Every structure is written in C-alpha cells, then in structure tokens.
Design a protein around this ligand. Structure first.
Ligand code: LBN
Ligand code: Y01
Ligand code: Y01
Ligand code: Y01
Ligand code: Y01
Ligand code: Y01
Ligand code: Y01
Ligand code: Y01
Length: 688
C-alpha cells in the first residue's frame, strides 16, 4: 500500500542500498573509502595545484598534524573573535550530541529493541526505530519524556555558550552613532553643533557624512591594476633586458594568429597610458563626489556614556495625540537638519561596512530586494526538491540523450548522478541571491544567508521528503486541501517507515565523510581560481590573481549547513536512535576541517555579534521540530486526546507562544536561550 507515494520525493534505491541492516554497514564502508581517497588527493592538490589550499598563511602530512597542534589563542591572534566564537558554538554541539548520544543509544534504543510490532519482518534496521512499539504501552511515555528533556538540554547548552561568549568590539565603535535620514546638505559643522549645543557633557570628535563612493572605488582598483602592471614589467625588463607585449582586447592569449589581432602592443607603454588615463578620471570622480551627499552621517563622541544617552533620547517612546512615539530635542539647527526623520543606531565596525552599497536606499532597495526574492521564491515553490525536477524531466522524455548509447550501467546510474547535481545546485541558487541585494554590511549579508539558506534546506532535506511531498505547491495543496484533518494520518504513517529512517541515517554518513572532504577540497573554488588564472592576460595579472583569491570565511553559509545536519540528527533522534552517533561523528570531522579552513585557508572577517547570537536561535529550532515528530506519531496511533498526544502538545503550545513573545521583545531572562554578561569612518578610498 504505502509505495506509490512514500518513495515519491526521492529517486529510488540502487541495489536495494545493500541487503543487511538498511544498507548502513555497506554505505559506511564505501563513504569511508572515499574519505581516504579524497584526503589522499587533497594531500597532493593542496601542495601542488597553485597553492589554492594554502593561500591565507611542511612535510607531506604537516597539514594534518597542524590541525591537532593549533591553540585557541593562536586562532584568536590569526582570525579574530568571530573564529573563536564559531569554534565555541561547535564545541557545545559536540557535547550536546554526547548527552543526547548516551541517552538515545543507552535508553531509547534498548527500549525499542524490546517491542513486538516489527519482530518477524525482514528489515533488521527497523527494530532499532520507534515503529517497533506496540500502541498500548506506557513505553511511549518514556519517548515523550525524552523528547521533552532534549529541549531543556538544548536550551541549557546555549545558555551556557552565550554566557561564556563575552564578545569584544573596539572602543572607536562603542562611541560612534550612525545617523540615517539627515538633510542631504548637512555639512559636518551643523551635525557637530547640534549635539554640542543640545546635550550637557557633550563633545563631538568627528561628524563624517557619507557620499556616493561607488565608481570612485572601482577606479581605485583599476588604477591599482595599472600600477601593478607598470611596476612588474619595469622590474622584469630591468633583469631580462628585453621588452614584452600584450593584446589590448580581452582574452589576449587566444590571439594565436594575426587576423585583426594587434597582440604586439608593448607592456610599458600600455601600462603607462593606462595608469595616466585612470589617474585622470579618478580626479574627475573625486571632485564630483562632494555634489552627491547620501544624507547619512557617522558621529564619533568623546564619551561612551553620552553616546548611550543620545542613543536613548532618539529611541524613547511616549504618548502624543496620534500615537506613542519618540521626541528628539530642539536646537539652533533642528529644522534645517530635519531632525524629524533621524534614525540613530550604534555604527558597525568600519570593516563590516560596504561603502559601495550605502548608495542604495529607500524605495529602490526594497523594490530591488523584493524582485530578487519574488522571482527566487516562485522558482523554489515549483522546483523545491531534486525529485520534482527529475520527475518532470521524465514526464517530458528529456532522458533521450542517454539512449543514444543505451548502456545498462548509464541508464541506472544517470538518475542518481542528476540528483547529486540538483541537490548541490538548488541551495547554491539560494545562497548566491544574498550577493545581489546589496546589504550595507557583512553582518546583514551573512544573517540573510543563514536564515534563507537554512530555511530552504529544512524543506529540501528534512520536511518535504519526509512526508513524501516533492514540492511546496504539493505541501500547501495537502495542507489547505478539503479533508486534511480526516486523512493526514496517511502522511504521518509515511514519516516512520524503516526505509525513511534508513535514508536519513545514510544522509548523515555521506555528510560526515564525503561532505567534509568536499569542504576541505573546495573543488568549485579551485576550478574558478584556475579558470580566472588562465584567462589573465599577463604575467603581472596572474600573480595579482593568486594574492586576491583567498576570501573571507562565509560564517552565514557555514552555520546554515551545520544547524541543518543538527536538525536532521535531533528530529530523527527519538524516532530513529541509531542516527545520533553518526551525528556526533559528523561534528568531530566538521570541527577538525573548520579549524584547518579558518586558520590555513581563509582570511579573517569582522562581523557584529548579531550573527553569532542569531545562529543560537536555530539550535532551539531542532528540538522544537522533534516534538512535532512525536505529536505526529502519538496522534496517529493513540489518537489526539490520549495523554502522550496532549503532553507533547501543551509543551509545544507554550514553546511556540513564548518564542512569539520573544519576537516582540528579547526582554525575558529566566525563560530564554540567551544568557549574557554586561578617523576610520571614512570610505576606504575617498581619503586617497
Ligand atoms: C515558507 C514558510 C517558511 C518561511 C519562509 C521565509 C522565512 C525567512 C525568514 C527570515 C528572513 C529574514 C532574515 C532575518 C533578517 C536578516 C537581517 C538583515 O540583515 O536584514 C536587513 C533587512 O534586509 C532584509 O529584509 C533582508 C531579507 C529580505 C529577503 C527575505 C526573503 C524571504 C523569502 C538587512 O540589513 P542591512 O544590510 O544592514 O540593511 C538594512 C537597511 N536597508 C539598507 C535595507 C534599508
Ligand atoms: C533522564 C535521566 C536518566 C536523568 C539524566 C540527567 C542528565 C541530563 C544530567 C546528569 C549529569 C549532568 C551533567 C553533569 C555535569 C556537567 C558538566 C557541565 O560542564 C562543566 O564543565 C561544568 C564546570 C565548568 O563550567 O567549568 C555541563 C553540564 C553537564 C554536562 C551536565 C549535563 C546534564 C547531565 C548529563
Ligand atoms: C555517542 C557514542 C559514545 C555512543 C556509542 C554507542 C555504540 C557502542 C552503539 C551504537 C549503536 C549500537 C549497535 C546498534 C545495533 C546493533 C545490532 C545488534 O544486532 C542486531 O540488530 C541483530 C539481531 C538479530 O536479528 O539476530 C547487535 C548490537 C549492535 C551492533 C549495537 C552495538 C553497540 C552500538 C555500536
Ligand atoms: C556508550 C554506551 C552508552 C552504550 C551502551 C548501550 C547498550 C546498553 C546497548 C546498545 C546496543 C544494545 C543492543 C542492541 C540489540 C541487541 C540485540 C537483542 O538481542 C536479544 O537478546 C534478542 C534476540 C532475538 O530474540 O531475536 C537485544 C540485546 C542487544 C544485544 C542490545 C543490548 C544493549 C545494547 C548493547
Ligand atoms: C528529566 C526527566 C524528564 C527524566 C525522568 C523521566 C521519567 C518521569 C520517565 C522515564 C521512564 C518512565 C517510566 C518507564 C516505564 C514505566 C512502566 C509503565 O508500565 C508499563 O509499561 C506496564 C507494562 C505491562 O505491565 O504490561 C508505567 C510508567 C513507567 C513507570 C514510566 C513513568 C515515567 C518515567 C519514570
Ligand atoms: C565515532 C563514534 C560516533 C561511534 C561510531 C560507532 C560505529 C563504529 C558503529 C555505530 C553503528 C554500528 C553498526 C550497527 C549495525 C551493524 C549491523 C550488524 O549486522 C549484522 O550483524 C548482520 C545481520 C543483521 O543484523 O541484519 C553488524 C555490525 C554493524 C555494521 C555496526 C558496525 C559499527 C557501527 C558502524
Ligand atoms: C509542519 C511543522 C513540522 C512545522 C514546520 C515549520 C517550518 C517552516 C519552521 C521550522 C523551523 C523554522 C525556522 C526556525 C528559526 C528561524 C530563524 C528565524 O530568524 C531569527 O532567528 C529571527 C531573529 C533574527 O535573527 O533577526 C527566521 C525563521 C527561521 C529560519 C524558521 C523558518 C521556518 C521553520 C523552518
Ligand atoms: C506551515 C509552515 C509553512 C509555517 C508557516 C508559518 C510561517 C509563515 C511563519 C511561522 C513563524 C514565522 C517567523 C517568526 C519570526 C520571525 C523573525 C523575524 O525576525 C526579524 O527580523 C524581526 C524580529 C527581530 O529580530 O527583532 C522575521 C519574521 C520571522 C522570520 C517569521 C516569518 C514567518 C514564519 C516563518
């Protein structure tokens, strides 16, 4: 009976996934052999293939021995506070999946193995899962009880973490306010004079307005390319005593024969005239920029306390005839400066700001972000999961190129190869959208990346293929429907099949071994780096590429993938106990790989605490989803009104409600996952 739908949302098993114990004994061995293969490969590719694994700084395995020798203090001196707090998050989850580890394997698994309901059946893996319990047993009360305890340990884990965190930001930031919405013709003097009149112990050290710096930074970078060329070809020619030539058009290497070619243009003359031209237009822009004030300012005060009391004075809220609202105070200049409109906030760190993107404000930023997210959301609505893509392909017969050869290896392999393809592609199409919204700050870009990327992964990886729905259209269709309340059991009975548990254990094994080896190899990065290197039109530009290619570490993506595997592991934790040790093994190997990547591979970022403290929210999201997975199980077997179905519902109603109060204000303390202890603001090139 449960066949024509429960295996609809993933393409189906190869060689039954291996005969014994749901394939786990087979898949674990093969993925482990791929681990040994890909790390042997990385040991060569790291050291040989144009330094790509080594840029942001040895015997054959001194890479590996370095992972085990690195100190936390030495991460701090190399990578700054964001790396330390990121590694502190992981270390709490490695502990949480050891208490959950020992309680799931120690007590939930032997209680399952006791049961009758799947005893005779062939599927030996299935016995370890909740489906093996008889319905009329208080043993379901123990499963309800642990699903509750795992919420409290997850809350206690993050209350511990957050109290240790004690994030540090430089004193220049603590005294600087970002004032947004000021009059466009507010010269520095009047911004200074407003506060230095209006507040008692006031003194303003700086008041720096913003300007439309976009093209001025473009020209600075181009000018730098010109200089790097001129200097290198000079230094080369002084030693070689022979000149060099480059084609002025793009992709100059491809000019292999003279047909409108003109490859013979001399390097020194080229870089000279180029540098002079760029210097000339750079001046023209710099003089023009002062006629484009963006109508914002950063103001830096002498005193941290007065910064606070201004910031409060503009955020106060009290009664007037229309509404409760704020009332910022009068002065000599309050009208000319339009103090009616000011939004006041602590400024980001000046390396956290995108001085380009400050240009894009008001109606147009929202119109542009809306367009990107509406077009994206429609695409994710109808193509949410790889299975609906492959199924729609088959319904339009586009498998046709395979049957040119029609080899029996290829026709059976090709579907799995395309699932790998779309599974890697669809979260990437989400992740890259954040790079076109033009967030004003690297915090904003990374927060947006976490919440979008994670949310999509929870539907692509966990929810949709669990209930056996291929797409968000199909999910809302089933939810709105006509008779949901009278038939939802047919989809809940689909979540707790042995086959479905076995699939999720296998997802985590592939994620532990192959997944992490790919995070070490970074082959898309390597491929883009080699193609960019090869297309560079000159020797000077090749060296330029090698220095530039090391990025800042993508904390938002790194969290989004991490809490996703945690969410799979801790939803399937009570219902399918065997999954948790592979969840732990994923976290050890991820933690070793990230210590390498942060220190050796990536450059340091600098991001506001909003990201690190934001990722704490999704750690609470994991055990919340696990109580749903028992409200489903309990409600379809015992009924809704039976005790285990009410208990794990009233708990959940309290948990949803207290979260949505937190969404109005993070002012709760005792019932809260967060426990806490109490010249540079000029655009990078406008100065030059
Ligand atoms: C289907 C059922 C489940 C729910 C699915 C959806 C759930 C998704 C859940 C949450 C989505 C939002 C994440 C939380 C806010 C991130 C913080 C942040 O930096 O935002 C800020 C607002 O910018 C945005 O609003 C960014 C996000 C807009 C796109 C939303 C797409 C929805 C799909 C950007 O910060 P900034 O760069 O400093 O600029 C702010 C000020 N200007 C410049 C913009 C004026
Ligand atoms: C369901 C029944 C079987 C009860 C299960 C009880 C557990 C949930 C308790 C028992 C002992 C507890 C642990 C006792 C000690 C610690 C060390 C503590 O970490 C420390 O390093 C403490 C000292 C320090 O902060 O320096 C963190 C909590 C933890 C893991 C506790 C977590 C909760 C545990 C596992
Ligand atoms: C977080 C970490 C520290 C926990 C480590 C726990 C392991 C010691 C546990 C996890 C899963 C357990 C295994 C789960 C399943 C089985 C199969 C079981 O045999 C059967 O299911 C077949 C019985 C039959 O049909 O004849 C024998 C024990 C064994 C290997 C268990 C042995 C102990 C294991 C490896
Ligand atoms: C790291 C620590 C916390 C692990 C400790 C966990 C053990 C208490 C559990 C883990 C796996 C369990 C085993 C999983 C499955 C089986 C098979 C099953 O064998 C039978 O006696 C029934 C065989 C049959 O009649 O078919 C029940 C006992 C046993 C060995 C279980 C005994 C208890 C074990 C060893
Ligand atoms: C941190 C907190 C939440 C941990 C403490 C959890 C307890 C309140 C749970 C865990 C195990 C549960 C017990 C597991 C087994 C049973 C046997 C059960 O009786 C049967 O199953 C009878 C079977 C038969 O005779 O056929 C009665 C409830 C009871 C005592 C349960 C009552 C609630 C217990 C003690
Ligand atoms: C590093 C930390 C996280 C602990 C990692 C523990 C693994 C090494 C354990 C966890 C589950 C174990 C497996 C659980 C079940 C089985 C099936 C079992 O199969 C049979 O005996 C065949 C017949 C059958 O039971 O169906 C043999 C052991 C094996 C592969 C176990 C091998 C050792 C595994 C992979
Ligand atoms: C049908 C049952 C299984 C419920 C399914 C609901 C899902 C759609 C929920 C479960 C967890 C939710 C996520 C849990 C936590 C967050 C973080 C949240 O962002 C914040 O933490 C808000 C504050 C901030 O960071 O600025 C944004 C929504 C999101 C992604 C939620 C989006 C909706 C999710 C995926
Ligand atoms: C059945 C499934 C598909 C769930 C359907 C309901 C969702 C459409 C709702 C449930 C909870 C909602 C979320 C609850 C809390 C937040 C945090 C909120 O974050 C903010 O930036 C404002 C709060 C703050 O950070 O101060 C933005 C809206 C969001 C993501 C909400 C977006 C819409 C969500 C995911």
């Amino acid at each position: 009976n449960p066949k024509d739908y429960c295996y609809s949302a993933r393409i189906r098993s190869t060689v039954l996934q291996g005969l014994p114990f749901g394939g786990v004994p087979t898949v674990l061995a093969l993925d482990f052999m791929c681990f040994l293969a890909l790390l042997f490969l990385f040991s060569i590719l790291r050291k040989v293939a144009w330094d790509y694994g080594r840029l942001a700084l040895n015997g054959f395995c001194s890479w590996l021995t370095a992972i085990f020798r690195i100190k936390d203090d030495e991460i701090r001196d190399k990578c700054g506070g964001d790396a330390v707090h990121y590694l502190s998050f992981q270390r709490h989850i490695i502990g949480l999946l050891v208490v959950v580890g020992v309680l799931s394997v120690g007590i939930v698994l032997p209680v399952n193995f006791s049961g009758d309901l799947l005893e005779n059946n062939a599927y030996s893996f299935g016995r370890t899962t909740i489906a093996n319990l008889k319905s009329g047993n208080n043993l379901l009360w123990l499963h309800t009880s642990f699903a509750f305890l795992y919420l409290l340990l997850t809350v206690y884990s993050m209350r511990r973490h957050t109290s240790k965190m004690r994030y540090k930001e430089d004193d220049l930031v603590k005294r600087t306010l970002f004032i947004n919405g000021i009059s466009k013709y507010a010269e520095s003097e009047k911004i200074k004079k407003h506060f230095e009149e209006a507040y008692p112990n006031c003194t303003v050290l700086e008041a720096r307005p913003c300007y439309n710096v976009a093209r001025l930074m473009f020209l600075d970078a181009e000018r730098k390319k010109a200089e790097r060329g001129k200097l290198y070809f000079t230094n080369l020619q002084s030693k070689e005593n022979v000149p060099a030539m480059i084609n002025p058009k793009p992709c100059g290497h491809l000019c292999c024969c003279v047909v409108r070619g003109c490859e013979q243009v001399e390097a020194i003359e080229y870089y000279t005239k180029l540098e002079q031209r760029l210097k000339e237009d750079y001046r023209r822009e710099k003089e023009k920029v002062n006629e484009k004030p963006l109508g914002m300012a950063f103001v830096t005060f002498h005193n941290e306390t007065i910064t606070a009391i201004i910031l409060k004075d503009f955020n106060v809220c009290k009664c007037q005839g229309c509404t409760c609202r704020g009332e910022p105070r009068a002065s000599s200049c309050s009208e000319a400066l339009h103090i009616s409109n000011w939004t006041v906030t602590y400024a980001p760190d000046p390396q956290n700001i995108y001085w380009e993107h400050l240009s894009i404000r008001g109606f147009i930023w929202w119109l542009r972000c809306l367009v990107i997210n509406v077009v994206l959301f429609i695409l994710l609505f109808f193509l949410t999961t790889p299975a609906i893509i492959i199924t729609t392909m088959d319904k339009f017969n586009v498998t046709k190129p395979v049957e040119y050869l029609n080899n029996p290896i290829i026709t059976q392999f090709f579907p799995t190869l395309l699932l790998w393809c779309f599974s890697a592609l669809l979260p990437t199409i989400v992740y890259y959208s954040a790079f076109f919204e033009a967030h004003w700050t690297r915090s904003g870009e990374n927060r947006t990346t976490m919440h979008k990327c994670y949310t999509f992964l929870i539907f692509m990886v966990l929810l949709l293929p669990s209930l056996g729905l291929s797409s968000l259209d199909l999910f809302f269709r089933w939810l709105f429907d006509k008779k949901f309340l009278a038939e939802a059991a047919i989809r809940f009975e689909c979540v707790f099949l042995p086959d479905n548990g076995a699939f999720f254990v296998n997802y985590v094994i592939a994620s532990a071994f192959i997944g992490n080896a790919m995070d070490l190899l970074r082959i898309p990065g390597l491929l883009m780096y080699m193609i960019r290197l090869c297309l560079a039109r000159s020797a000077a530009e090749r060296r330029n590429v090698k220095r530039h290619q090391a990025y800042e570490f993508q904390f938002g993506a790194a969290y989004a993938w991490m809490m996703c595997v945690f969410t799979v592991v801790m939803t399937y934790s009570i219902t399918c106990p065997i999954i948790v040790p592979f969840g732990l093994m994923y976290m050890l190997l991820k933690h070793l790989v990230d210590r390498y990547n942060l220190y050796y591979a990536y450059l340091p970022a600098k991001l506001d605490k909003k990201i690190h403290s934001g990722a704490v929210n999704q750690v609470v999201a994991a055990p919340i989803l696990c109580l749903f997975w028992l409200l489903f199980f309990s409600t379809m077997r015992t009924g809704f009104l039976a005790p285990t179905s009410m208990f794990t519902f009233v708990v959940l109603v309290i948990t949803i409600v207290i979260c949505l109060c937190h969404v109005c204000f993070g002012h709760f303390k005792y019932l809260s996952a967060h426990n806490y202890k109490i010249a540079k603001y000029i655009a990078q090139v406008l100065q030059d």
